[PDB]
Amino acid sequence: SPQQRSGSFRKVFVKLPSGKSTIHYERRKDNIARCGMCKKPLNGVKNNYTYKYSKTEKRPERVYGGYLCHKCLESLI
Template structure:
């Protein structure tokens, strides 16, 4: 009988013929996919990809970057998000910029806290 830990679907089985002529089954466990940016799908830097039992043993600083939205957004998307938010804050905060033609981008807004746009209006 096969060991219990090798009966999982996440363990890949390959058959190989030995020099003696018999066929043996070799087991190789699947590695999880790398983390991707939630907005553009680019691979994220600074996030390890390993099985959960090994990730659990890492310290918090080793699991994800310490910057804002670390582990969710890549650096380019984060920069766009901060620029987007700042532009709206300037438009609502200063009268001389109130006529700026800005369009809302919902792909960025889903990462901002709920009601942030209403708070700007008040």
């Protein structure tokens, strides 16, 4: 139950007028979605720990917009 790297330490006092100090533990940042062989996550695509339920806010508006840019694609159509 001591330290574990799978959690980042934060301490807060700048934007702060009350008077105490403590420590908050949050999980490390995510990344643009995963498996791998073609290996390029994208531009304009969104990854968040929770989901704001967004639909077009988390993907571009081209033909294959969320899948990948025009790189690993045209041998699929």
